Amino acid sequence: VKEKLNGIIDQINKVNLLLEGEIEAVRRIAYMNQASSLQNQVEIGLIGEYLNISSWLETKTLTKTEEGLM
Amino acid sequence: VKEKLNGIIDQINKVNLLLEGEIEAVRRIAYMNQASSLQNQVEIGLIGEYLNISSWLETKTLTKTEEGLM
Amino acid sequence: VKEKLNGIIDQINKVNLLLEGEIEAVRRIAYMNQASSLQNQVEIGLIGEYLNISSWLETKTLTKTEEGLM
Ligand SMILES: CN(C)c1ccc2nc3ccc(N(C)C)cc3[s+]c2c1
Ligand SMILES: [Cl-]
Ligand SMILES: [Cl-]
């Protein structure tokens, strides 16, 4: 009785710990990716300004991207 | 008896809700990152075409990236 | 008795499987995003070198990005 319930509680704790650990690992990556994609957007944006093509590059960019996303 | 099992069921529900909530939050970010990285790839691609260096920029890009990834 | 506990164990397994499946799906995306953002950083970096503006583009990039991130 007591040991079946204690066995069950232990599996609940293992599931909680294992999955929370995987999630935290995936979170760390996703936060890193968010920062990299912001950095890349900034840098691309600067190059666009340097070349003085910002406005047309942007419209072409937004429509092709929306097309790629469907 | 009934209350030990009910206590257990309640912890299973809390684990389910909490983790599902974290996952959904991480999912939202990852989908945002996917859209940003597509947009950035498009824009970089357009700049490459504007500068008329697309083919050589691409080969240099793919090999350095594969190297960075090992 | 036996069937309440067996019912409980079954829900623990469903929670484990379902959430692990969502996590693995989100992981796959995050690993894809990491590779795309590296590729984009490389390509942006190459364009910068081609234009011979690498150093100034970088400083402008890092500070605007840090500003965007607060
Ligand atoms: C080799 N170096 C230093 C550079 C520097 C700036 C440049 N800007 C451009 C702007 C437009 C363009 N078109 C063909 C539209 C071609 C180029 S090529 C180019 C090469
Ligand atoms: Cl991500
Ligand atoms: Cl990116």
Q: Concatenated DSSP letters for A31-55?
A: HHHHHHHHHHHHHHHHHHHHTT-HH
Compute how many other C-beta atoms are within 10 angstroms of the C-beta atom of residue A41.
21
- Any long-range contacts for C59-65 (C-beta under 8 Å, 24+ apart)? C60/A46, C61/A39, C61/A42, C61/A43, C61/A46, C62/A39, C64/A42, C64/A46, C65/A35, C65/A38, C65/A39, C65/A42, C65/A43
Tokens of B42: 């498009």
Q: How many residues does chain B have?
A: 70
- Residue among B14, C1, C68 nearest A1 (CA): C1
Largest CA distance in chain B: 76
Identity of the amino acid at B28: R
Identity of the amino acid at B20: E
Identity of the amino acid at C63: T
Sign of the Cα torsion A29, A30, A36, A40 reads positive
By what technique were these coordinates determined?
Answer: X-ray
Please report the resolution in angstroms: 2.1
Question: C47 — contact with chain B (CB < 8 Å)?
Answer: yes
Question: A54 — contact with chain B (CB < 8 Å)?
Answer: no
Nearest ligand (C-alpha, residue C44): 3
DSSP state of B52: T
- Measured CA distances, C1 to B2, C4, C9 (Å): 10, 5, 13
Compute how many other C-beta atoms are within 10 angstroms of the C-beta atom of residue B23.
21
